[model samples]
Target: SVKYQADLWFDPLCPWCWITSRWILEVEKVRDVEVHFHVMSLAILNENREDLTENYLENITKAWGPARVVIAAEQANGASVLDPLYTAMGIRIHNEDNKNLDEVIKRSLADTGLPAELAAAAQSNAYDDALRESHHAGMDVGTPTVHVNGVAFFGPVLSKIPRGEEAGKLWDASLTLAAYPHFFELKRTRTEPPQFA
Candidate 1:
């Protein structure tokens, strides 16, 4: 049997994307699936939005740096670099509750054995074009967008990482939905914020 190819597009800054990524990682353990990580930018997604609050606007402004750095690392190396770099960035940014992106970027580069100067790409637009290309290709509804086989969908946006059998079951259901071209969405109101555990 051929293993499923699951591609997830994300921004390191989004807690929702982080949770979804973790769930998929669990799915990899329990299901016959290979997960691929790709970069998407919340900053670029919200760049034209006129309705964002002042605090969120500021956060989005800073969001571009990490995505730029990730793209630069991928361009300099290869796509194989994305998963570890994304994992390193997410651990520091989310798990450790770090807000200092400069330190986070540098440390994540070190964690992944990437060139230290790749951190400079965070503050530079040199990789913005490549960033946008990756972003546009992966984005449909928003960050954490997923592609199963060749079909793309917005997300099975998760508030927490599903474990073991639960993760495999969720992947089964999601794959079923993706296989049916007409099945578009299944969503409910979120009553709780993202739970990191």
Candidate 2:
């Protein structure tokens, strides 16, 4: 069986994207696929929007740091560097609810055995151009934007990670939907926050 690529564009600050990412990871374990993580900024995405809530705006403002750090790490290292780094940061930001991103950025680098100095990118614009290029590569309205076999879609915006065969079946369904050109979206009001377990 030929392996499929699951490209996931995300910002670490989003719990929903965290859940979707976790689901994709689960899918990778159960299905013949590889996940390619990419940086997409909520700060950039929401930059020009004048209607954000005060709290949303604040969080979005803080979102750029982790993303910049990720891009810098990828640029310095390689695309292979993304998975562990993203997983480390996601665990801190979403699973642990650590909003202190500077600390989270440092700790994630340490956890991933990446150089501590890479954390400086969190506050630097040096990688923003590369970040923006990646963000646009997976064009969509939000984080958790996914491409299955090169067919783009916004999400399976899961509340929790799907495991084992359940994860595999979801990947199968996503691929099936992607095969049909007319499938645009399916959504429901999220009734609960993301379940990190």
Q: Against the true structure, whose lDDT is highest?
A: 1
**Tens digits of per-residue lDDT for model 1, 1-197:** 54899888888888888988999999888888898888877876766667646665576557788988998898888999989998899988888889889998999999999989888887787876776788778865555798888899877888778999999998898888988999988989988877776
**Model 2 regions lying over 4 Å from their true place:** 52-61
Q: What is the Å distance of residue 71 in model 1 from its true position?
A: 0.7
Give the clashing pairs for model 2. none
RMSD of 2: 2.1
Query: In lDDT terms, how accurate is model 2?
Result: 0.83
lDDT of 1 at 88: 92
Clashes of each: 0, 0
Local lDDT at 29 for model 1: 88
lDDT: worst 10-residue window of model 2: 52-61
The total number of steric clashes, by the backbone 3 Å criterion, in model 2 comes to 0
State residue 21's C-alpha deviation in candidate 1, in Å: 1.0
